[PDB]
Amino acid sequence: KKVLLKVIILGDSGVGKTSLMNQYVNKKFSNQYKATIGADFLTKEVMVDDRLVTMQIWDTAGLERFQSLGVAFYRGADCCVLVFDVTAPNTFKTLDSWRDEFLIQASPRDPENFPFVVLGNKIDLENRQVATKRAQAWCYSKNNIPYFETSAKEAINVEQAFQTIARNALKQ
Template identity: 70%
Template sequence: MLKVHRVIIFSQIWDTAGQERFQSLGVAFYRGADCCVLVYDVNSMKSFDNLNNWREEFLIQASPSDPENFPFVVLGNKVDVDGGNSRVVSEKKARAWCASKGNIPYFETSAKEGVNVEEAFQCIAKNALKSGEEEEM
């Protein structure tokens, strides 16, 4: 539960952990979503490379009314690992990918240490609220 502009937002978060076996459940999980959060591991190029697949899969499964403007937020997670020495995806590369997909908001996070988690969820909630309001119009 988050509060945005004096509105209380309740959220459901589905974590598929990037596992292929959850792709067949996409319609049930994604339909009706107001925002999609894509998370990758900054220490894994494969994880980053899969962002395209997960974004496209979400758009297919959720079938939003306006896919070009559907809100996404990208989180580059695990920035705390090994003091940043094992990092393989630069912030610049991630931001460039986000820009190429319509200026998707991007946050570098550490779920373990709580770095940027609150800020990311505030952004997610604001985007979800905005998306929900636009659909009602």
């Protein structure tokens, strides 16, 4: 068989969504910021629990008015990755609106069990402002969402987080 999993990456402008995707797919990182204006995807062949799957990873605009255009691409997603910046508490605050907007627009049949994963990114930086335990509490309050702390720049937890993403997305 061939299984294609659709994964959607959401989060505020600048949290590192594009960087996380680029680190996972191409093992490349750039400190140069170019803002994502249009949603678009990369494809990667992933191996999950001795099963080969094609992961279609969608990168979206975090910017405040372009993000409504991302909504058209929610439909059919098998997993939703929510990303925030551990140094920027305003990007943590928006996770609920991102999640609710995804749930009502994508409209899975089983919203309580739909696969989310939450990445708290940029831990390589100094002076984090969002406490690990605070993010963990939010994730737990949403029916035990898996939480990873990542660094796209230093390649910490990117592979592990996307392995969980692949696995939960693959669940029938």
